[PDB]
Every structure is written in C-alpha cells, then in structure tokens.
Design a protein around this ligand. Structure first.
Ligand SMILES: Cn1nc(-c2ccc3c(c2)OCO3)cc1C(=O)O
Ligand SMILES: Cn1nc(-c2ccc3c(c2)OCO3)cc1C(=O)O
Ligand SMILES: [Cl-]
Ligand SMILES: [Cl-]
Lengths: 134, 138
C-alpha cells in the first residue's frame, strides 16, 4: 500500500501532462512532457522512483508502456506494474494559468497547491503513511 | 530545521545541474537545466517547494537569485532565502554515465542511488527525510 502509485496522462494545449498519484495519500507529482513516448515515460518513472519508495505503478497499460526503455527502467528501479483529483487539478491549472507564461509553470503551481492544501494536506499524509511503514 | 534546504550548481558536459539537499537528512533532488538563469532557477524552486515543505533555501546568492522571477517564485511559495555529497554524486554519475544516452538520465539514476543507498544496518536519506518530517508533523 504505501508503495503504490497510479500514473495517468492528461492533455492540455497540445501537450501531455503525466500525473502520478500516491494512492493512499492523494499526493501528486506531475510534469509536462514533450510527447507520450516510451523514452519520456521511462524518464518520468525513473525520476519518481528516485524521490519516493515506488514499488508498484498502476498505469493505463497503453503503447508508451510496451517498449524496451520503459521495461528496462522499471526493472532497474525495482518497480512492478500491476478522475477525482484530475478535474480539481485541471481546475487549479485554470485558476493559475494567467499568472504564468508557460503551461509547465502553471502545472507546477497546481502541484504545489494540491499537495499543500489543508485536517492534513496530501504532503503531510504521504509522509505520515511512509513513516508509519518504516 | 526540517524545512531547510541547500541549493547548489554543478557543471558537467557543458550543462548545468542544480542539486537541492535537505540539510538534516542528506536527501537530494537534482535536475539538469538548459542554463543557470533566473527563470530556470525559479522553476526548479517552485517544483521543489510543491513536493516537500521548503521554508528556507541556502544558496550561493549568485546572479540567478537577484532577478524579479526568482524573487516572485520564492514569495509565492513562501520560501525565505537565508562539495561532499556533490563529489559522491559526481562519482555516481560517472559510474552510471555509459548506461544512459543522455546526461539527464544519468543524473536521475544517481539521484535514485543516493536517496536509496542504506549505508549499513542503517537508514537511507529517503527514510531519514520522511522520519524527520513526520516527527515535526506530530
Ligand atoms: C499544509 N502543509 N503541507 C505541507 C507538505 C507539502 C508537501 C510535502 C510534505 C508536507 O511532506 C512531503 O511533501 C507543508 C505544509 C505547511 O507548511 O503548512
Ligand atoms: C532504502 N530505501 N529507502 C527508501 C525510501 C524510503 C522513504 C522515502 C524515500 C526512499 O524517498 C522519500 O521517502 C526505499 C528503500 C528501498 O526499499 O529500496
Ligand atoms: Cl500514460
Ligand atoms: Cl545556483
């Protein structure tokens, strides 16, 4: 449970956003990526796994997961494979879109808002969950 | 203490790496950025602050911190601006460099290895940051 994430893609302004949610806490990491390719997906998963203890990722099982680069990345990082945040995040992105030149900045502001919003925030919940596991 | 990070720049292969260390645990976040400019620095700080409780960042106070964009990002996120690892990290990057087509990939494998390495026993930096922050929460 504390090691379980769900990864989804969302599309805005021509670009692709990957959103990983830590299922037990609702905490999110999200990035705008150039294209929904195996190489970018692998890179996103490598970054996530270096930052938080990722044991299993639930994905949409689509084309960007079938290639050798993504497979090698999950294997290397030790990851196994196996929208109630999403409109909220879209909404937050809409709320802040005007204050940033670039979509990637608005996405990161929305991540900040989502994870900090508060009895506990998603940021407090993920730490409490993982600490409890340790 | 739990909210204190140090941010430094490292240069390799013509590119700039920013490395943020969480001072009490040794946990790191690091990225290769296109140039050491205020816009990229601000964006790096926004990202970091959305993921971990960042209260204060100790920097080198250089040119990329003096501009409007960085100051507005720190203000917005509620952040005040008040060699060892960085060589071990450089070494881990060298160790993995040939397995990565791109430097950015090697940097993130080095981040993974640094944060997960259990130096005996007996906690990793990743375990230590979570333990420190949860303690503070309670
Ligand atoms: C509500 N709140 N949430 C956080 C917060 C945000 C992100 C995190 C985290 C705590 O631990 C891991 O990642 C900080 C605050 C605060 O200082 O008020
Ligand atoms: C050594 N090790 N440390 C962790 C670990 C634990 C808690 C964390 C983290 C990494 O990053 C943020 O919070 C996971 C493992 C592992 O089982 O490989
Ligand atoms: Cl996807
Ligand atoms: Cl710097």
């Amino acid at each position: 449970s504390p090691g379980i994430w769900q990864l989804d893609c969302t599309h805005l302004e021509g670009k692709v956003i990957l959103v990983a949610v830590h299922v037990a806490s609702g905490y999110i990491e999200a990035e705008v990526i150039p294209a929904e390719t195996g190489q970018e997906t692998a890179y996103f998963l490598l970054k996530l796994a270096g930052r938080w203890p990722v044991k299993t990722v639930h994905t949409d099982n689509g084309s960007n997961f079938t290639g050798a680069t993504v497979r090698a990345a999950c294997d290397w990082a030790g990851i196994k494979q196996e929208e109630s945040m999403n409109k909220e995040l879209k909404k937050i992105i809409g709320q802040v879109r005007d204050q940033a030149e670039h979509l990637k900045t608005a996405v990161q502001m929305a991540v900040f808002i989502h994870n900090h919003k508060r009895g506990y925030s998603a940021g407090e919940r993920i730490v409490d969950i993982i600490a409890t596991d340790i």
